[PDB]
Amino acid sequence: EDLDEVKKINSEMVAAKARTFRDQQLEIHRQMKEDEKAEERSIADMLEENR
Amino acid sequence: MREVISIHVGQAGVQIGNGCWELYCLEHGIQPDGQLPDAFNTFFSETGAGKHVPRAVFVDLEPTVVDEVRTGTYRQLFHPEQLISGKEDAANNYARGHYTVGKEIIDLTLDRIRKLADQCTGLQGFLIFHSFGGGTGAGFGSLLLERLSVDYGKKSKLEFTVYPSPQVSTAIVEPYNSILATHSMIDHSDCAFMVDNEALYDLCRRALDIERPTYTNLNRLIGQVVSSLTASLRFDGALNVDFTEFQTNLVPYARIHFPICSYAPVISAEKAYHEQLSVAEITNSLFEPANMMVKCDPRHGKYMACTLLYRGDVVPKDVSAAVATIKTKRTIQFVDWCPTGFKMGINYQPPTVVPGGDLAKVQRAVCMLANTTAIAEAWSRLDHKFDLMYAKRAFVHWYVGEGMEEAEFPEAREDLALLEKDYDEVAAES
Amino acid sequence: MREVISIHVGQAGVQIGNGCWELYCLEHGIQPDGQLPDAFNTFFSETGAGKHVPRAVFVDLEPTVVDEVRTGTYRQLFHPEQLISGKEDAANNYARGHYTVGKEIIDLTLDRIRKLADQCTGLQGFLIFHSFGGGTGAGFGSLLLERLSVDYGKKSKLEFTVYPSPQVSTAIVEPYNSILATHSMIDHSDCAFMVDNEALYDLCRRALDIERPTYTNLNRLIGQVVSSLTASLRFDGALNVDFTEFQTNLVPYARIHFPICSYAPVISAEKAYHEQLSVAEITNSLFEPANMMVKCDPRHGKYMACTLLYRGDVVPKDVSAAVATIKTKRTIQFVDWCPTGFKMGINYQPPTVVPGGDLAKVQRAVCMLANTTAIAEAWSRLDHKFDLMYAKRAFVHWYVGEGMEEAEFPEAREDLALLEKDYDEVAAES
Amino acid sequence: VREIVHIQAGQCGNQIGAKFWEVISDEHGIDPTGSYHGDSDLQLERINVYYNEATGGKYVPRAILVDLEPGTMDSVRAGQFGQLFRPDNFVFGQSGAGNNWAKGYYTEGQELCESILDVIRKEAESCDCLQGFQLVHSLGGGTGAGLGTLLLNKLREEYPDRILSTYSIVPSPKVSDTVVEPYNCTLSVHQLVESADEVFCIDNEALYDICFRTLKLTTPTYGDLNHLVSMVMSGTTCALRFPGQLNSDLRKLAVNLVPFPRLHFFIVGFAPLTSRGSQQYRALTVPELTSQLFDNKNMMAACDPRRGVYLTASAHFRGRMSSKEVDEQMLNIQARNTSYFVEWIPSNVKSAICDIPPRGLKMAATFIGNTTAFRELFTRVDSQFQKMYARRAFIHWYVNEGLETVEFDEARSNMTDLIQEYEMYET
Numbered sequence A: 001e002d003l004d005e006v007k008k009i010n011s012e013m014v015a016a017k018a019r020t021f022r023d024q025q026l027e028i029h030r031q032m033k034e035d036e037k038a039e040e041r042s043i044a045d046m047l048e049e050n051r
Numbered sequence B, C: 001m002r003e004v005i006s007i008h009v010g011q012a013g014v015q016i017g018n019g020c021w022e023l024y025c026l027e028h029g030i031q032p033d034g035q036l037p038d039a040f041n042t043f044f045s046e047t048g049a050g051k052h053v054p055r056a057v058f059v060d061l062e063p064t065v066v067d068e069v070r071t072g073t074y075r076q077l078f079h080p081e082q083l084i085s086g087k088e089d090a091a092n093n094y095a096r097g098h099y100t101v102g103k104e105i106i107d108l109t110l111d112r113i114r115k116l117a118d119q120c121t122g123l124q125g126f127l128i129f130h131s132f133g134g135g136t137g138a139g140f141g142s143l144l145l146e147r148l149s150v151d152y153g154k155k156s157k158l159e160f161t162v163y164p165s166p167q168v169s170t171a172i173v174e175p176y177n178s179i180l181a182t183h184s185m186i187d188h189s190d191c192a193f194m195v196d197n198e199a200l201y202d203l204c205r206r207a208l209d210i211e212r213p214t215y216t217n218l219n220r221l222i223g224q225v226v227s228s229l230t231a232s233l234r235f236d237g238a239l240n241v242d243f244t245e246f247q248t249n250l251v252p253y254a255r256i257h258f259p260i261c262s263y264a265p266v267i268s269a270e271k272a273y274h275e276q277l278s279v280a281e282i283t284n285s286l287f288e289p290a291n292m293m294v295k296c297d298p299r300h301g302k303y304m305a306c307t308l309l310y311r312g313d314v315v316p317k318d319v320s321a322a323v324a325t326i327k328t329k330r331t332i333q334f335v336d337w338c339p340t341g342f343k344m345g346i347n348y349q350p351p352t353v354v355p356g357g358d359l360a361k362v363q364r365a366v367c368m369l370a371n372t373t374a375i376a377e378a379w380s381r382l383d384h385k386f387d388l389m390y391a392k393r394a395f396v397h398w399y400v401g402e403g404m405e406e407a408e409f410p411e412a413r414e415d416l417a418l419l420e421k422d423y424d425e426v427a428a429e430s
Numbered sequence D: 001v002r003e004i005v006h007i008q009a010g011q012c013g014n015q016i017g018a019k020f021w022e023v024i025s026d027e028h029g030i031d032p033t034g035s036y037h038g039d040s041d042l043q044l045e046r047i048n049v050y051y052n053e054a055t056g057g058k059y060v061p062r063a064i065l066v067d068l069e070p071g072t073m074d075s076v077r078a079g080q081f082g083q084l085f086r087p088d089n090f091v092f093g094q095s096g097a098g099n100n101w102a103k104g105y106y107t108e109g110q111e112l113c114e115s116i117l118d119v120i121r122k123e124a125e126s127c128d129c130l131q132g133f134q135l136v137h138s139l140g141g142g143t144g145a146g147l148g149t150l151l152l153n154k155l156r157e158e159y160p161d162r163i164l165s166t167y168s169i170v171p172s173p174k175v176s177d178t179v180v181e182p183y184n185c186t187l188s189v190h191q192l193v194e195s196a197d198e199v200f201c202i203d204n205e206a207l208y209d210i211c212f213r214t215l216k217l218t219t220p221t222y223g224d225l226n227h228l229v230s231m232v233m234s235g236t237t238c239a240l241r242f243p244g245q246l247n248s249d250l251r252k253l254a255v256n257l258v259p260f261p262r263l264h265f266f267i268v269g270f271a272p273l274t275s276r277g278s279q280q281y282r283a284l285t286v287p288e289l290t291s292q293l294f295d296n297k298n299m300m301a302a303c304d305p306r307r308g309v310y311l312t313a314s315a316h317f318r319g320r321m322s323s324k325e326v327d328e329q330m331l332n333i334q335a336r337n338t339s340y341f342v343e344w345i346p347s348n349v350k351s352a353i354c355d356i357p358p359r360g361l362k363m364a365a366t367f368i369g370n371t372t373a374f375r376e377l378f379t380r381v382d383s384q385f386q387k388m389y390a391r392r393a394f395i396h397w398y399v400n401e402g403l404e405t406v407e408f409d410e411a412r413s414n415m416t417d418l419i420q421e422y423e424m425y426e427t
């Protein structure tokens, strides 16, 4: 009865980090996508509208 | 060995199934392609060598959702003939799905299912997923069930369908398709579970700390319930429950089959450290109206029969104490003529987690299936919505032009009225 | 085993509790994260891997103070579901917190309290904290107690509230809230302890060299008294005292429950060296009005019931000698119909100091709880202030517009008047 | 698999179509020479819907171009994407447009219709499951207004099952650019009601309003004006071409939005739109898009929906967003403004999501609605036509081509009946 809580606890620590990695990966990708979209709006106005 | 067969119709059925088989592969331990890196016979078929194939059939008139699986990572696992695709949507029209386009493709699906059943020598049962609002889910599903009922006779045809939400509606013709399909299910479905998206959204927002859920999170939660239902037949336990046992005990009559579903503990990762979650805690959470998968308050109605399934390190002693504690609650109403009301089952397989998922890694879990008269509240809402439309004949021209007779609409309306009358009559006491 | 549930309302309740829990954790020896580097059930709850969670619910209509705990050091200790914060505070309005805003959030808190009590199987009573002059403090507390009266019945609902000071005041509408609170408290509360801010301010310099204390220093003094009160249930002692033991002896009548509190010895770090601080000194100094935490002179009133709680090197022989000498004091008067009027309890665990605390590590201490007719002096002042308020209808429009009916003001005035006569009749001799 | 055939009629249709094909060519990533050079494999998943494949990696759109004057084809050929279109598909006349409905319908319509039908029939057999036809024309002059009705009638005769949808431009109430528009539009309405399943009406005055307020164009031109209409077309067909959480094709849209066969005239909207100096400030999210879509100013038809009542409406979203957020926004807007919607049709606002957003935009949405506000547009043309036809001798220009005056009265009678049906269903 006291054994199975170790199964719970070990996955408990590692998958919080796993969710942390997933979220950190997501914000970084959206940051990179934000930079690309910042360039896209730049060429939209600084190039095309200025053209 | 002892086999089950699953059928997925419509957009919702395919996407729900995609999440379901993701859990099954991880729980059973199979590569995305089907190679190994037991109960295998129960869910999968073995193609010789080291490859396995699932016992699933995907059907939709829309090629798009099927092609996503065809070009997906799991494409190698799925046998190409198992993926059936049409050419055009059913236009959310039950007449189009049931009469015009469905009959063009019905024989192709039936032949494959019969071919698949031959390999399932120890088969017992079917599972079909539906979206009531969608034209293909209702129009094709009613046609498929009518054929399967006479093809196979005495086999347990269980269903798991998505009932329309009380307020969140994405289809305007949804009340029409819901009532017509309901007329078909009540006659040819042995036992059909309901869920609604609005309750899932609230549960995914309150219990899980997910601000903006999508269909992906909702599908995974449904898959957990299906796995828990089938866990008794896939793993050892002190109390194994077969599909025949569910059919006998859940339903007290024939037309009152419709059960309700619930699951616990639905908990995020950070809360799992902060709590202990013993057997008493998880048992109490099931009966709270907050955790219910259908947006109906049980306090308005009564309970007819209830079934509980347990997974993990559950001890039969604690289950008996928890059930006794629940019976002492005056807020839970039971009819006089069903004092027992409860069947408990225990299985030793703990829940399986999914990387990047929304659920914790709890030592134990419990599934809740029961029959209640509170489901008649949802029938009243759909009945009222249909009457408003049919009073002015708001959409008759679309359905009649697709080959369905107008006289079918009052027949479906009368059938729903008898069902509501039956639930009120059974809920009565002497 | 044996448990106590703590509920905190308003800025006073939350910020006092924060001082209480820092004392509780260091005394028992649990880290801020809930880990370790007994009687834990009294105020702590246990989770599987050894993480501890307090048995407390923090409730406030303003999220500012609750958020401070959320970002504070102790954020790991409390379960996020126990920290409930509202949207807008009661704005120092009794009617607003009683009817408009409090009823929006009341149902959520009661579920949290009921859910916590299940893990507290050996529950023996509730401790609730309020500010009398505040709007959320008094207004939300009245509704909570009224609900708990029917929810749990015969359970000891002890309270610890800050009474408005005789002269120092930080709220103009303070007399309105206090009397309306007084009406609600006197009916349902089993026994509510009373302290005032002004006497806390005076002793904080008179007993120890602090020239300008803040709310932080005062709250530590409050927590020490609470720790002494609950020390009997927490540690070994020569004379066990339970909550019902206080309840029976302290109150001779239903409506005369309101006791007073005192503590000794309160002494600075250096001055504690010069005095022996024997049993005689701590017992004799308790009766002085300087050490009283309610600014009412006992010489004006009479003594009917006293309770002594000891923690230290206390020997029963010295207790008998000290009490006998006290009865020889002609300055102390007792009602003739109550000759004994003393219950004493001895516990072995000495008080535990706070790193950064403002008290010395005194080897032995004692807590004083008594009920006196001198509190009638305090009541009359509030009655006089209210009559000045209601003679010209100073702030009636604010409270009436929030749903409160105007007829409640004379009814609350009558209830306070009846209490004043009841205290006079009891104090009368025969 | 769900292919679409595109038809462009007249001066207005060809210029709008030229911008329209430039948008889809940019979206899929087709080089002006006709060779694929894009960056994502998803673009080639379902390119068969709008494009045909030629040997050598060259793609040619299913485009049919029709006009009575060759001058419009000269501009189309000289355009940047002129080489993309199939030269044989360029069908044209050799006479003036005439600025007349009867002249286009009777005199030159019969001569051109046989050739146009055969050319379209070529493309009709090059598609397995052609869902329906798409038409671009204006109701003002008579080239597109007159010939488009004849072609639309013939297409319905040949292909009854297929969904016939048109994008029509109505005569502006104040910036009308022809002395005889009310005659042409009134005659065109009769054929539009019975033939086309779905009709989208767009007015130039609303387009000028939208550009000036939001886009702040100092010197707007037709190229800037037609860009917005090209956006609306691209969003409508986005379900067929790309994956989504909830696919919704045209036949889904027709079933939901149309309660009765004659009530099918719709009003369309697009979001987001921002001044190119104000795009820094906008915290563009799902609620921000919902505010723009249902705002009356962003509507491309000069008819205020507030003065009327709403029938069934639908909204299509492009990009990645939460399903719950989209569902809640539609519920909130439907319940907050219950006075606008008819009580006897609950769940008025249909939702749909597609996964891939257009270029540059992280997410975008399109609005299509059905309402009785169309009576105002018909009221304007009816009143003008009454004051036109009161001087009955002005009909003589149409009489020369064989149009008897009794046709005008019958056309108004059918048009008047359409208003009355819209009036009746208000309550």
Ligand SMILES: Nc1nc2c(ncn2[C@@H]2O[C@H](COP(=O)(O)OP(=O)(O)OP(=O)(O)O)[C@@H](O)[C@H]2O)c(=O)[nH]1
Pocket (backbone or CB within 6 Å): B009, B010, B011, B012, B013, B015, B016, B060, B062, B089, B090, B091, B092, B093, B097, B131, B133, B134, B135, B136, B137, B138, B162, B170, B171, B197, B215, B216, B218, B219, D245, D246, D247, D252
């Ligand atoms: N929870 C959940 N519901 C889904 C999902 N996918 C589809 N649905 C439901 O499916 C309903 C609509 O059905 P459709 O998507 O049109 O599928 P269909 O049955 O083929 O309908 P037709 O194409 O018109 O024949 C929506 O109201 C959704 O609630 C999903 O992934 N998760």
Ligand SMILES: Nc1nc2c(ncn2[C@@H]2O[C@H](COP(=O)(O)OP(=O)(O)OP(=O)(O)O)[C@@H](O)[C@H]2O)c(=O)[nH]1
Pocket (backbone or CB within 6 Å): C009, C010, C011, C012, C013, C015, C016, C061, C062, C089, C090, C091, C092, C093, C131, C133, C134, C135, C136, C137, C138, C162, C170, C197, C215, C216, C218, C219
């Ligand atoms: N002794 C002491 N008193 C406190 C402390 N914090 C708050 N108070 C008392 O709280 C009383 C008023 O509290 P408020 O926060 O203003 O009002 P409330 O009771 O929370 O109700 P609201 O009007 O809705 O804010 C004051 O008279 C203070 O004496 C504290 O830390 N120590």
Ligand SMILES: Nc1nc2c(ncn2[C@@H]2O[C@H](COP(=O)(O)OP(=O)(O)O)[C@@H](O)[C@H]2O)c(=O)[nH]1
Pocket (backbone or CB within 6 Å): D009, D010, D011, D012, D015, D016, D097, D099, D138, D139, D140, D141, D142, D143, D144, D145, D176, D177, D204, D222, D223, D225, D226
């Ligand atoms: N928005 C837009 N409108 C146009 C364009 N070209 C022509 N129009 C409008 O179309 C209307 C009539 O055009 P017309 O040549 O008579 O087309 P016809 O009806 O087919 O004969 C005029 O009022 C123009 O304002 C264009 O490129 N863009």
Ligand SMILES: [Mg+2]
Pocket (backbone or CB within 6 Å): B010, B011, B012, B062, B089, B134, B135, B136
């Ligand atoms: Mg579908």
Ligand SMILES: [Mg+2]
Pocket (backbone or CB within 6 Å): C010, C011, C012, C062, C089, C134, C135, C136, C137
């Ligand atoms: Mg406050």
